[PDB]
Design a protein around this ligand. Structure first.
Ligand code: A1BSP
Ligand code: A1BSP
Ligand code: ZN
Length: 139
């Protein structure tokens, strides 16, 4: 689990969004596994505006923050899960690292701020849904 709070927005994995998120929907994209909903309170997270390829992510299944190198956002084939059939996921970044399904929502950060959230993984890889291209999250 996990979410990003910036301005009056909440950014979550689309597969983990709640009924309140869908009723208060701002934008979602199934191919990215992202959903953004509106909030009443101001959030404290800052989104990175950069092309960093090194950062640190939170892995709940190890209670640890791991430093990693990751690929730039790309279109990647992802196998089926209980939430989606096998498909191409867009804006996805991969790193070598541990992850399990319930690690989705863990944040990836670089020196500039929040980069993305855990969305895919297995077999020694972890995949993050990028949010840096969503410039409207800051305005
Ligand atoms: C479109 N929609 N989907 C859900 C949902 O819970 N789906 C299972 C989780 N999921 C997997 N992938 C995407 N979501 C939902 C709930 C309330 C209103 C609208 C909704
Ligand atoms: C981090 N992580 N996430 C998943 C997962 O099932 N994600 C559900 C959302 N999803 C995205 N594309 C398809 N389904 C996973 C599985 C095994 C090991 C690690 C994992
Ligand atoms: Zn950066």
């Amino acid at each position: 689990s996990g979410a990003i709070y910036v301005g009056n927005y909440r950014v979550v994995n689309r597969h983990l969004a709640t009924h309140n998120d869908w009723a208060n929907l701002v934008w979602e994209d199934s191919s990215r596994d992202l959903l953004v909903s509106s909030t009443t309170a101001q959030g404290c997270d800052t989104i990175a505006r950069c092309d960093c390829q090194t950062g640190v992510y939170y892995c709940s299944s190890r209670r640890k923050h791991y430093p990693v190198s990751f690929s730039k956002p790309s279109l990647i084939f992802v196998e089926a899960s209980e939430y989606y059939p096998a498909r191409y996921q867009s804006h996805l970044m991969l790193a070598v690292g541990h992850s399990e399904p319930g690690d989705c929502g863990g944040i990836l950060r670089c020196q500039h701020g929040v980069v993305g959230i855990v969305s895919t993984g297995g077999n020694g890889l972890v995949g993050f849904a990028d949010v840096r291209d969503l410039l409207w999250l800051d305005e």
